[PDB]
Design a binder for this molecule. Sequence first.
Ligand SMILES: CCCCCCCCCCCCCCCCCC(=O)OC[C@H](COP(=O)(O)O)OC(=O)CCCCCCCCCCCCCCCCC
Ligand code: HEC
Ligand code: HEC
Ligand code: HEC
Ligand code: HEC
Ligand code: HEC
Ligand SMILES: COC1=C(OC)C(=O)C(C/C=C(\C)CC/C=C(/C)CC/C=C(\C)CC/C=C(\C)CCC=C(C)C)=C(C)C1=O
Ligand SMILES: COC1=C(OC)C(=O)C(C/C=C(\C)CC/C=C(/C)CC/C=C(\C)CC/C=C(\C)CCC=C(C)C)=C(C)C1=O
Ligand SMILES: COC1=C(OC)C(=O)C(C/C=C(\C)CC/C=C(/C)CC/C=C(\C)CC/C=C(\C)CCC=C(C)C)=C(C)C1=O
Ligand SMILES: COC1=C(OC)C(=O)C(C/C=C(\C)CC/C=C(\C)CC/C=C(\C)CC/C=C(/C)CCC=C(C)C)=C(C)C1=O
Lengths: 70, 68, 243, 48, 376, 376, 59, 122
Amino acid sequence: RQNIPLREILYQLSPYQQDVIRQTFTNAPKTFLRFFKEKGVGLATFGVLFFGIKGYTEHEMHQERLAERY
Amino acid sequence: VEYTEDDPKPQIEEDCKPHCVKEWAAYKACAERIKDDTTGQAHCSGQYFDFWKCVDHCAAPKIFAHLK
Amino acid sequence: NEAADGLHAPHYPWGHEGVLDSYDHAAIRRGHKVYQQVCAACHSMQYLHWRQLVGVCYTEEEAKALAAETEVEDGPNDEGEMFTREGRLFDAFPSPYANEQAARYANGGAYPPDLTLISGGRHNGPNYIFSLLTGYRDPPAGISIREGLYYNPYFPGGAIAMPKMLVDGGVEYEDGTPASASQQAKDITTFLAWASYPYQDEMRVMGIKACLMISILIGFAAYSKRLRWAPIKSQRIVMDVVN
Amino acid sequence: PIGVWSVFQGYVTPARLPSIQTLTRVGAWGGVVVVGGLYMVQPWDWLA
Amino acid sequence: RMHNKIQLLSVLNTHLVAYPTPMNLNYSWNGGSLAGMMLASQMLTGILLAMHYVGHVDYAFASVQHLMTDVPSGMILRYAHANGASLFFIVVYLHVLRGMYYGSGAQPREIVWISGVVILLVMIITAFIGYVLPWGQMSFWGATVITSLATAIPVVGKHIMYWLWGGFSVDNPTLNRFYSFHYTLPFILAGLSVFHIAALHQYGSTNPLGVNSQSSLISFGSYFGAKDLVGALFLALVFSILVFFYPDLLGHPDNLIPANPYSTPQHIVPEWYFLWVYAILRSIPNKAMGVLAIGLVFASLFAMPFIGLGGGKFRIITEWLYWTFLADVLLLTWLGGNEITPITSFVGQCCTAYLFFYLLVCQPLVGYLETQFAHG
Amino acid sequence: RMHNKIQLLSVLNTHLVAYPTPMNLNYSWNGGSLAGMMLASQMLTGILLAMHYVGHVDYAFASVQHLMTDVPSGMILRYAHANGASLFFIVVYLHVLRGMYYGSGAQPREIVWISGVVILLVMIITAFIGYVLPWGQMSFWGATVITSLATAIPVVGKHIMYWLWGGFSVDNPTLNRFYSFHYTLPFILAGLSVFHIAALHQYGSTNPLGVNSQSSLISFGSYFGAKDLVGALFLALVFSILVFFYPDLLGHPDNLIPANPYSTPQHIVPEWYFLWVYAILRSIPNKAMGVLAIGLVFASLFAMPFIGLGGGKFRIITEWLYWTFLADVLLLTWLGGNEITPITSFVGQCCTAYLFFYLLVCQPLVGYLETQFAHG
Amino acid sequence: VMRLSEALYQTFFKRSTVYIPMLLVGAYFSNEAIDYAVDKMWTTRNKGKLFSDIIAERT
Amino acid sequence: TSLLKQVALPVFNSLATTYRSVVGAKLAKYGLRFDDLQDPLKDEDVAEALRRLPPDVVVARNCRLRRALDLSCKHEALPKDLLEKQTPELSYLQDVLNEVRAERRERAQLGAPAPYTRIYYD
Ligand SMILES: CCCCCCCCCCCCCCCCCC(=O)OC[C@H](COP(=O)(O)O)OC(=O)CCCCCCCCCCCCCCCCC
Ligand code: HEC
Ligand code: HEC
Ligand code: HEC
Ligand code: HEC
Ligand code: HEC
Ligand SMILES: COC1=C(OC)C(=O)C(C/C=C(\C)CC/C=C(/C)CC/C=C(\C)CC/C=C(\C)CCC=C(C)C)=C(C)C1=O
Ligand SMILES: COC1=C(OC)C(=O)C(C/C=C(\C)CC/C=C(/C)CC/C=C(\C)CC/C=C(\C)CCC=C(C)C)=C(C)C1=O
Ligand SMILES: COC1=C(OC)C(=O)C(C/C=C(\C)CC/C=C(/C)CC/C=C(\C)CC/C=C(\C)CCC=C(C)C)=C(C)C1=O
Ligand SMILES: COC1=C(OC)C(=O)C(C/C=C(\C)CC/C=C(\C)CC/C=C(\C)CC/C=C(/C)CCC=C(C)C)=C(C)C1=O
C-alpha cells in the first residue's frame, strides 16, 4: 500500500492522559484573530464587490422608479 | 387603557399627519401640476404612497396600544 | 410599476410573532365570530372543519352546537335522492355558493377567494390583511374608479371589488369587548393567521426542545471528537531534516 | 494535467496530431448519425 | 480476520473503517457526508409523503392540505421535505465551491468532477419537477414558463413541447408524468453518488495544503466518523430551526394559492437555488442565446479538469480571483429575484460576462502564469 | 489496454467480458439472466405505467381504463406489465428449482442462496401489493384476507392490523400507501440482484457434472452472450404470445369489477404464483399454525445450505426424490385454486407434510447416506 | 485530575449488557426533565393566552 | 511584437520575484520548498523526475512533507529558530524535471510518445 521511505521517531500519548476541551477556551480569541488575519483580504473584496454592485443597482432602480412619476 | 366602541384608528392617523408634512406638500404639488391634464394618464400615486407610508409607520404601534 | 405593486403595509406588533410566543386564543374566538357574521356571506374557508376548532377555540359541546346550526347536504338515501341534515363535527365549514361561477355572478365578476390559507398566501400576510380591511382611503389625483369597484391602496392595482364590511358595533362579542372596526379587523386577522398555521404553538414547543437537545449534543459530540483526535493533535515527530 | 498543460508544454506537435486520413475516416461517422436519425424519425418525403 | 471471511464485510471494512485519509483535513471536507445525509433525508421523507399525496389535478392541493392538518406528523414531514431540498442545495453548492477553490477536479480526479457535474444536473431536474407537485400558482406557472423554452429550438420546438406536456397546455398528464419522473430520479441520484464516491476512493482526497499526503494517512472510521458527526449536528440545528420556527421563510406565498391557468401572478420567480440560472436566462434578450449560455456554463463546468490550472492557498492570484467569482455568483442569485429593468439587465449581462471570463480566461491563463512564476 | 486506464471499464471488463465461466453449462443456466431481463422489463413498464395511474379510490379503476383505451400503446404497456409478473415468477421458480436440483447453495455459495431467498420474499411482497393497485374485487378482497391475518399473533394483533390499514378497514389510506411501497420495493430488488450476482462472482458457477471446473473455463462475454440471447428470444416469443393473443388468460375475471366492500365474490383466490402458499395456509385448520407453517417453509429454505447434502446426477436417490418434490409443489399449486372440501383438506395436509419431510429429513439424511455409499 | 471511581466502574460500566439498560433509564429521565423545563417555561411566559386558561377562568 | 518583447522580460522577472517572495513567506512557516508543491499524482513528468533522484533526496522530501502535514493538522507554524533557517527556494528537482520535459518535447517532434504513463492504482 504505497511504501513511503522515511526516517522519524513518533511519540503518542493516551487520550486518557491529557485534557479534552480545557485549552479550547484559551485558544479561542487567538484562533478568531488568526482566522480573520488569514481570510481578511478575500472576505473584504467579496463584501466590497457584492455590496457595492448591489447598492449601485438598488440606487439606480430607485432613480428609475422616480423618473416614471408625474 | 380604556377601550372605546368608536374607532381610534382615524384619530391616531390624524394625529401622525403633522409628522409627514413634507410628503403631503410633495403630493399637493403633484396634484396641482397635473390639474390641466387631458390624456387621463397623469396620476400622483407614488407621492400619495410616500405620505401614507410615513403616516402608517408613525401610527402602527399606537394603533395596537388602544386595542385588546 | 408602483401603482401595480400597491402600498406596502407597516409592521404591527403582533403578540404571536416571537418564537417564544403563543397565539391569543381569546382573539381567535372573537375572530371566528367576525367570520360567521361578516365574512362567511361570501367566503368559503373550505379546508376548515368544526373538529379542528375544539381545544383551540371552543369546547366540544360549543362546537357541536355551532355545527348543528348549519344545513349540510347529505346522501344518497335508499331512494337515490339528496337530502339535508344538521352539521356535525366532521363536517366542513359551509360555503356560501355552490361553485365559482355563481360566486363571480354575485360579486360583479370577481371571485372572493378562500380564506383558509390567505394569511400565508400573501406577502406580509397579517399586516397586509389588517391594513386592507382598515384602509379604504380617498383616491389620489388622476386616479378614477369604475362603478362596482372601491379604492384601497393596499390592494395591488388600487381597485378592489370588496366594499367596506367592518363597521363599529357590527359584532356583539360575548366577553364584553367593545367592537370597533379596528378591533374586529385585528381579531379576524388573528383568526386567519391561525387558519394558515394551525399548529404554530406545538411547532414552537417542539422547536424549543429540539434546539436545546441539539445544542447540548453539539457540545457532547465536540467532546467525543476532541477525545478521539487527542493522540494525533499532541504527537511528537522528530526527524533529521532542518532545511 | 492533460488538456491545456499539454499544449502549453509543447507536447502537441504536428507529428503527434492525427493524420488527415484518420480525420477523414473518423469524421465519416457523421453520416452514420444523420442516417440513424433519419431512420428513427422517418421525417421525409424522400420515398416518393 | 472476521471481515476476511465475507465479501460484504471486507468491502465495508476497506471503504469505511480502515480507509486511509489525510490527517490535516479541515471542516471544508465535510460537505460530501452532509450531502449524502441530505439525500437520504430527502428520500425517506419523500417516501413517507408519497403515501398521502395524490397526483391528480383535482386532488393534489387538497391532499397536501389534508396531509398538513390531519395526518399525524404530516406537517413535520412536509416541512422537512420542502426545507431539506433547500439545505441539500446549500450543502451541494458549498461542496462545489470548495472544489472550485482548491482545484480538486485536477488530475487524477477528472472522473470525480465529471460525475459531480452529472449529479448536479440530475439534482436540478429532480427539484424542478418536484416543485410542480403541490400544483400551486408558482408550481403551474414556472413549469409553463420553463418548458416553453423548448420552442426556442426551430422547426421541432413546439412538437417537443407538446410531447413533454401530453397536450396543448400544462395539465393533468404533465402532473402525472412529473410525479413518476420525480419519484424515479432520486434513485438514479443514489446510484450516481455511489459511483462518484467509489471514483474518489481510487486515489483518495486532497488536503488543505495542496501537497502529496501519502506519508500522513489515518483510518477513516475511527477519526472522521466523529468529525462528520459534529457537522451533522450543526446541520441538524439549522434544519430544526427552519422546520419549526420559520417554515415558509425559503418559500413563496403564491404556491399556497391553487393553480389558475387564466390568471398569472405578477412576479413569477423560482426557488432561490435556480435564481442564478434564471438571471443568466433573463439577462440575454434572446431565448436561444440564453439557453446556449446556460449550456455553455455547464460545458465550462465539465471542461474544468482539462482547462483549469491553479489551486489552493499557495497559488495566490487565482485564490484572490476566487472571491470575485463568489461575489459574481451571489450577485447572479440576487438579480434573479428582481424584476426586469434596464439597470438589472445591464448588470446581469456584465455579471454573466464576468462568470464566463473567470471560467474560460482566468483559470487556464492566470494558472499558467502562476505555475511559471512558482516553478519556471 | 484502454480498459486498464478507467476504473469503470476495468470492472465492466472483469465482470462482463473476460469473466471465466465453465464451458459445459447447459440451457438451465440461463435462468438468472432471464430473471434480470424480466426485472428490467417490469421496472420499465411500471415507470411508464405510473405516468397515467392515479393512486386514489374513485379514480384508480377509471385511470386504468383510460390507460387501456386512450393512452397510445397503453394497452400493450398494461398487458406487458401484468403478464411480465407471471413470466418473472416462472423464470425465478425454474431458477430456484435448478438450484434445488444441483445443490447450488452448498459451500462456498451459501451467501448466494441466502440472498436469493431474500430476493424471493421481496418479490412476493412487491407482486402482492402491486396486485392491490388496480382496485378491483380481487385486489380489495385479497388485500383484506391477507392483511387481516395479523390477528394470529397474541395480544399485539389488531393494533398492527389497524396500523397497516391506516384505519379500520382496507380503504383509501391502504391503497395510497401501497402505491408508494410498490413503487419503492423494485429498486431494493435491483440492488439485491446486484449484490446477489456479486456474491456469485467470488467463486464462480457450478457445472452440470458437479465437479471442480477450474481447468476448463472460457470467457463469458463472447460465448455466453449469444447463448443468453437465444433464451431471451424464446422468452420474448412466449411474452409476445401472452400479451397479444391471451392477455387475460392468467388473470381472474372478477378483477374487472370495481371493488365493493359490502359484497364479496364467491371464490377468493390469488394469482397463480401465490397459490402453493395459499394451499399450505388453507389446508391447516388454524390461522396461527398456518402462519407458523408458512414461516417454517422459508426458514427451511434459509437453512438449506447448512442442512442440504446431495446434488445433481451421480447422486441418484436424491435426484429421484427431486421429482417427487416437484410433483408435491405442483399439486399444492393446483389445490390452491379449488374450494375447501374434506378430501382436498386431507390431500393438502399430506402434501404439506411431505414438503416438510423432503426439506428437513430427505435432504440431510438421504444425502449423508449417499456420501457414505459413494465415498465411504 | 478528576477520575471515575473504580467501584462505580465495576458495576455500571464494565459490561455492555448492564451499561445499556442504565443508558435507557437515564435517557427516559433526561427526556422527562427536558419536557418539564420547556413546558414550564412556555406556560409561564404565555399565561392568560392559552385555551386552558380561558376554560379554567370560566369555572 | 519583438520591439516590445525585449523589455517585457524584466517586468516578468520583477513580478516573478515579488510572487516568489510572498509565496516563500507563506511556504517557510510550514517548512516547505517550492519544489515540494509538485505532486507525482498530478503530473507524470514529476513522477518520472522523482524516480531519477538519489534516495536521500526523496527521504528528505518525504520528511518535509510529513512535517508540514503535521503542522497543518496542529494549526501551528514552525518556531522562530526553525523559521529563520528555512530556505524555500533551494531547488532539488528543477534540473531533473527540466531534463525530463526537454526529453518529452524532443520525442514529440519525431512522433514518439513519452516512455511512461500516469500513475494508475487498483
Ligand atoms: C434610495 C433607496 C434607499 C435604500 C436604503 C437602504 C439600502 C441598503 C442598506 C444600506 C447599505 C449600505 C451599507 C452596507 C454595509 C454592509 C456591510 C459591508 O459593506 O461590510 C462588508 C465588508 C466587511 O469585510 P469583512 O469584515 O472583512 O468581511 O466591509 C467592507 O469591506 C466595506 C464595504 C464598502 C463598500 C460598499 C459601500 C456602499 C456602496 C454604495 C455605493 C453607492 C454608489 C453611488 C453612485 C451614484 C452616485 C450619484
Ligand atoms: C431536491 C431534491 C429532492 C429529492 C432528492 C426528492 N425531492 Fe421530493 N420534493 C422536492 C421539492 C422541491 C418538492 C416541492 C416541495 C414543496 O414546495 O411543497 C418535493 C415534493 C415532493 C412531493 C409532493 C408533496 C409535497 O409536499 O409537495 C412528493 C410526493 C415527493 N416530493 C416525493 C419524493 C420522493 C418519493 C423522493 C425520493 C425517493 C423525493 N421526493 C426526493 C425535492 C426533492
Ligand atoms: C360584499 C361581499 C364580501 C364580503 C362580505 C367580504 N368580502 Fe372580502 N372579497 C370580496 C371580493 C369580491 C374580493 C376580491 C376582490 C378582487 O379580487 O378584486 C374579496 C377579497 C378579499 C381578500 C383578498 C384580497 C386580495 O388582495 O386578494 C381578503 C383577504 C378578504 N376579502 C377578506 C375578507 C374579510 C376579512 C371579510 C369580512 C370583513 C370579507 N372579506 C368580506 C367580497 C367580499
Ligand atoms: C461538481 C462537483 C461535485 C458535486 C456536485 C458533488 N461532488 Fe462530491 N466531490 C467532488 C470532488 C471534486 C471531490 C474530491 C474533493 C477532494 O477530495 O479534495 C468530492 C468529494 C466527495 C466526498 C469525499 C469527502 C468530501 O466531502 O470532499 C464525498 C463523500 C462526496 N464527494 C459526496 C458527494 C455527494 C453525496 C454529492 C451529491 C449528492 C456530491 N458529492 C456532489 C465534486 C462534487
Ligand atoms: C432461492 C434462490 C434464488 C433466487 C430466488 C434467485 N437466485 Fe439467482 N442464483 C441462485 C444460485 C444458488 C445461483 C448459483 C447457481 C450455480 O452456480 O449453480 C444463482 C445464480 C444466478 C446467476 C448466474 C447465472 C445463472 O443463472 O446461474 C444470475 C444472473 C442470477 N442468479 C440472478 C438472479 C436474479 C436476477 C434473480 C431474481 C430477480 C435471482 N437470481 C433469484 C439462487 C437464487
Ligand atoms: C414482481 C412483480 C412486479 C414488479 C417488479 C413491478 N410490478 Fe408493477 N405491478 C405488478 C402487478 C402484478 C401488478 C397488477 C397488474 C394488474 O393486474 O393490472 C402491478 C401493477 C402496477 C401498477 C398499477 C397499474 C396497473 O395497470 O395495474 C403500477 C403503476 C405499477 N405496477 C408500477 C410499477 C413500477 C413503477 C415498478 C418498478 C419500479 C413495478 N410496477 C414493478 C407487479 C410488479
Ligand atoms: C474521506 O472521504 C469520505 C467522506 O468524507 C469525509 C465520507 O463522508 C464517506 C462516507 C460517505 C457518506 C456518509 C455519504 C453517503 C453516501 C452516499 C452514496 C449517498 C447516497 C446514498 C443514499 C441516499 C442511501 C439511501 C438509500 C437506501 C438505503 C436504499 C433504499 C432501501 C431501503 C430504504 C431499505 C466516505 C466513504 C469517504 O471516503
Ligand atoms: C416557480 O417555478 C419555477 C421553477 O421551478 C422551481 C424553476 O425552476 C424556474 C427556472 C429554473 C431554471 C432556469 C433552472 C432549471 C432549468 C431547467 C430547464 C430544469 C430542467 C427541467 C426540465 C427541462 C423539465 C423536463 C423534465 C424532464 C425531461 C424529466 C426528466 C426525465 C428524463 C430525462 C427521462 C423558474 C423560472 C420558475 O418559475
Ligand atoms: C386471495 O387472497 C390472497 C392474496 O391476494 C390476492 C395474496 O396475495 C396471497 C399471497 C400472499 C402471501 C402468501 C403473503 C404475502 C407476504 C406478506 C409478508 C404479506 C404482505 C405484507 C404487507 C402488505 C404489510 C405491509 C408492508 C408493505 C406494504 C411493504 C413493507 C416494506 C418493506 C419490506 C421495505 C394469498 C395467499 C391470498 O390468499
Ligand atoms: C453462469 O454464468 C453466468 C450467466 O449465465 C450464462 C449469466 O447469465 C450471468 C449474468 C447475466 C447478465 C448480467 C446479463 C443479463 C442482464 C441483466 C441481469 C440485466 C438486464 C438489463 C438489460 C437488458 C438492459 C438494462 C438497461 C438499462 C439502461 C438499465 C441500466 C440503468 C442505468 C444505466 C441508469 C452471469 C454473471 C454469469 O456468470
